[PDB]
Design a protein around this ligand. Sequence first.
Ligand SMILES: *[C@@H]1O[C@H](CO)[C@@H](O)[C@H](O)[C@H]1NC(C)=O
Ligand SMILES: *[C@@H]1O[C@H](CO)[C@@H](O)[C@H](O)[C@H]1NC(C)=O
Ligand SMILES: *[C@@H]1O[C@H](CO)[C@@H](O)[C@H](O)[C@H]1NC(C)=O
Ligand SMILES: *[C@@H]1O[C@H](CO)[C@@H](O)[C@H](O)[C@H]1NC(C)=O
Ligand SMILES: *[C@@H]1O[C@H](CO)[C@@H](O)[C@H](O)[C@H]1NC(C)=O
Ligand SMILES: *[C@@H]1O[C@H](CO)[C@@H](O)[C@H](O)[C@H]1NC(C)=O
Ligand SMILES: OC[C@H]1N/C(=N\O)[C@H](O)[C@@H](O)[C@@H]1O
Ligand SMILES: OC[C@H]1N/C(=N\O)[C@H](O)[C@@H](O)[C@@H]1O
Ligand SMILES: [Zn+2]
Lengths: 499, 499
Amino acid sequence: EITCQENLPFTCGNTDALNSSSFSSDFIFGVASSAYQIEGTIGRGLNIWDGFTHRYPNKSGPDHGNGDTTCDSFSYWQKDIDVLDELNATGYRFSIAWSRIIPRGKRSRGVNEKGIDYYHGLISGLIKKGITPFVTLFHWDLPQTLQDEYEGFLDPQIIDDFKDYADLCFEEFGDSVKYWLTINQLYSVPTRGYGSALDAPGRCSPTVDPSCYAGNSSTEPYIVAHHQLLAHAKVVDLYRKNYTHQGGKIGPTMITRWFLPYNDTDRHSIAATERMKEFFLGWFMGPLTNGTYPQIMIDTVGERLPSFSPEESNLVKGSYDFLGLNYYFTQYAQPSPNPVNSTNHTAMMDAGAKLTYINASGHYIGPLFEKDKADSTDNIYYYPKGIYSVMDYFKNKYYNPLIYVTENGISTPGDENRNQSMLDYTRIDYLCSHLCFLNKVIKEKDVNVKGYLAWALGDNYEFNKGFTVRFGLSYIDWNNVTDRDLKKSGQWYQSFISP
Amino acid sequence: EITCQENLPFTCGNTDALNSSSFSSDFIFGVASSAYQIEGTIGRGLNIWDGFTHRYPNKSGPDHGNGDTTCDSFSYWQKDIDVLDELNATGYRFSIAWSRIIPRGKRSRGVNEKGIDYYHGLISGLIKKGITPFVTLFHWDLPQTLQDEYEGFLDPQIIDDFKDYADLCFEEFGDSVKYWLTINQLYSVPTRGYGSALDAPGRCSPTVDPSCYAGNSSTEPYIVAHHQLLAHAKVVDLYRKNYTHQGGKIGPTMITRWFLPYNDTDRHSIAATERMKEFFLGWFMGPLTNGTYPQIMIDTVGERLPSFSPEESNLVKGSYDFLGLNYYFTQYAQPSPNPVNSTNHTAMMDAGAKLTYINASGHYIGPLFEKDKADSTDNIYYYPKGIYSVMDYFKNKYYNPLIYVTENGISTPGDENRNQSMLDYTRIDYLCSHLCFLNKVIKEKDVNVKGYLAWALGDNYEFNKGFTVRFGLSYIDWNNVTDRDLKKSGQWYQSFISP
Ligand SMILES: *[C@@H]1O[C@H](CO)[C@@H](O)[C@H](O)[C@H]1NC(C)=O
Ligand SMILES: *[C@@H]1O[C@H](CO)[C@@H](O)[C@H](O)[C@H]1NC(C)=O
Ligand SMILES: *[C@@H]1O[C@H](CO)[C@@H](O)[C@H](O)[C@H]1NC(C)=O
Ligand SMILES: *[C@@H]1O[C@H](CO)[C@@H](O)[C@H](O)[C@H]1NC(C)=O
Ligand SMILES: *[C@@H]1O[C@H](CO)[C@@H](O)[C@H](O)[C@H]1NC(C)=O
Ligand SMILES: *[C@@H]1O[C@H](CO)[C@@H](O)[C@H](O)[C@H]1NC(C)=O
Ligand SMILES: OC[C@H]1N/C(=N\O)[C@H](O)[C@@H](O)[C@@H]1O
Ligand SMILES: OC[C@H]1N/C(=N\O)[C@H](O)[C@@H](O)[C@@H]1O
Ligand SMILES: [Zn+2]
């Protein structure tokens, strides 16, 4: 019988009690990254994260930081492999920058052979060290040209451009890459990129944020989400029809959260919690498992929710061999109005829920996850059992999928000095508390989870936050980025992997 | 009788002997800038100077500097107006960033009203201080989308996109702007952007520079130059047919240089010198005055030189109300082979000339203009009489045009500290020596020159050099860019203007 802690102090950092041998022999352990965040612009075209951070610097991060040079994994990819080798990691999730291999967006305009060579070397070096690649085709860094030609995922033109890009990746790298992820966190671009405009490309309704260059927060999230599903599905069908000889697997990445009622004896809060599951997870998992959006979304969103034709439904339903599930935290849900006629209406209001980390009786759900110094009542708190709840829910509700945990991790503040940042015991407690629950759900619920990739391999540019927070298991000095030095968490993870 | 100095020491910094009253009463005096170099990316889309400096950082400058923030004239445009007001300047040349007003390149994709507002405020503030704007529509900063859709000026699609952009500028700002420049230095994009790949977009033949993403240095300069002439001419015809009510004037900007024989008793060097005039100046001035390229270019370049149809010839011939002539220096020319079959052949080799600053008897042409610490035999030297020679030549060869000197200036090294940089006596000597010759040619040759705009208003990002050199008449601290403090040269220029 496995017992896991939900509250500080944690004791799961003792590798005598929790280690890789606690999991099945074949279980993959590693770390994750993405291309905007780590490579730098050298050698690639420009994408919408370049565009957004440069046009709206105060949205790039409080320090106005961006991915121009970052940790320079363009030059120092071997040092990333060395970190993985030091960890004895068996997996590494990274992304391919579309703008590095097809700087002009549309594949007929030519490829960047040097870009292709950069990923070939990375992939070869990973394999030579026994590290299985998990490659994300699209971690948000859309070539700027596509955004400017047709507003990217807002237009159905994205489908074929994304398919031709994907096809080039499978042709060039699929002999060695056997695990592909299509779009990172399907929920995030529609809502943050086209709803709140916190993320690239930064579109929204005028009264949501007057800085947005265009948009409609009420309708565009749905359009973009629908196009993401179609583009994803077209790529999975291409992979499974044209690249079955490579013997690999493909899936989407979901951001997952658990949801609990803000008041667990209040029917209205319970109903909001179930609505959040459908609006946050079912918005994509209903299409992916059934070819349709959830009924509550059909009902509430009405004419703003696109329909799938019968062909599209069939393309999307079942369009995965596995699911990459990212997991960081859980929210309490309570009812909230949905003012659909308000000029500041967003798609995120359609769920009819307000989300918090404190419940009605004043209980904070778990330890601190992210401090927000400008408004401390907006602090995020984590909830280790949420990983158990999410995996259980996916098995039960979503037809027993094969799952890889493709991100899990926690930041520490960029204001800490190097010594403080290296002594990242808060990160060991976060990681180990989640791994304990992950082992527990695999054993108790028989969830088909086959690997875990912690966020992040190293310190990097953090979307929305610049370099004001650090997520790495290895530390990078921004005044001299060559080295990636294992923190206390990296050193702990090394011992967890090889106890 | 006017006597002007050609060699150090100069004495023309004494405003008792040379000042604005030496020139006609109506003569315009001011300074110049360009939008990439001064504004920053905030509030605009991305262009090919963003793309080039980010993809090829070692070509942006030795410091890898770029125009991301620069002197932040987006925020501090009023401080630029204050500099001009302090100078009592009567003119200011600046450029409009296409990517600020039409971030998506093609006007039908929408305009950026806030971008438009930024130039309206600038223009209104200039006029309120009695400063005549001279506005460059295109100072090299092509929206990246156009480069990625069709390779920008490489394709004839540029013509209409540039025309629709220009039309928006005339509609929005032409009620107040009465002097328009179309393309900055017609020679430079074809040769540096598409020949040597020193400049955006960075195309060349593979053996010229293996880093180029595509190109052909032998043919693409000609294609691009031809499209520039067509696009320029289409915009001048639009201005003169549709905006004649505004009562303004439009012209191209030429980079001018004088050329002298490396050996003035050697027929071969004399012939090379005359070939350089045709290949450097006549490449554009033959079309602009006659609708045809020079005969020597027709003969030498052969099938690589595009033809104008009769309609195009007529559009281009006479497509100026004035000429903006930039002038910085003069070269000696000697013969050089033109290996047209060599894989590393460039269009610049077609003139059959090698250019130096030292003649056959060892004479350096004038004072130091730019030191090149990596190869000192590549140092540039200036030649004050060259401004006289150029203006005389334009009057005699090119049908007595109306001329504004739209750039003239000199750098000082970025390694100097602030005190040294403020004590920029070398810049006073450069400026005054040229102004003396400019007054002399107006008086002696009756050249129709009506104003002079020194490069630059302030320190800025220098194409190819980052922040490793300074050109300003006012100093900017890169650790805190708000202020623009007049240097010794700005203070001298103030007294020259108002003696
Ligand atoms: C941040 O920048 C935008 C311009 O993109 C401006 O509209 C907004 O007010 C600024 N935000 C703050 C908090 O100052
Ligand atoms: C607009 O929404 C903001 C946050 O969504 C809210 O504080 C404000 O009341 C809303 N305004 C109206 C008119 O509903
Ligand atoms: C930068 O870091 C690398 C790795 O530690 C080191 O070898 C190199 O000397 C350092 N550079 C400077 C300038 O300190
Ligand atoms: C500069 O960068 C390019 C890659 O864009 C590389 O090909 C070239 O060798 C580097 N130049 C030098 C002098 O190192
Ligand atoms: C290529 O040109 C470079 C400079 O233009 C020159 O030094 C070299 O000789 C040329 N090579 C050939 C094969 O002509
Ligand atoms: C920056 O320069 C401006 C102008 O001199 C000054 O007012 C402001 O205090 C300076 N900022 C800092 C942080 O020094
Ligand atoms: O916020 C941490 C990490 N979290 C993420 N999702 O939750 C992103 O996919 C990744 O790019 C980001 O850096
Ligand atoms: O090199 C000085 C100056 N010289 C220029 N031409 O000669 C450019 O138009 C301008 O952008 C550049 O900064
Ligand atoms: Zn940048």
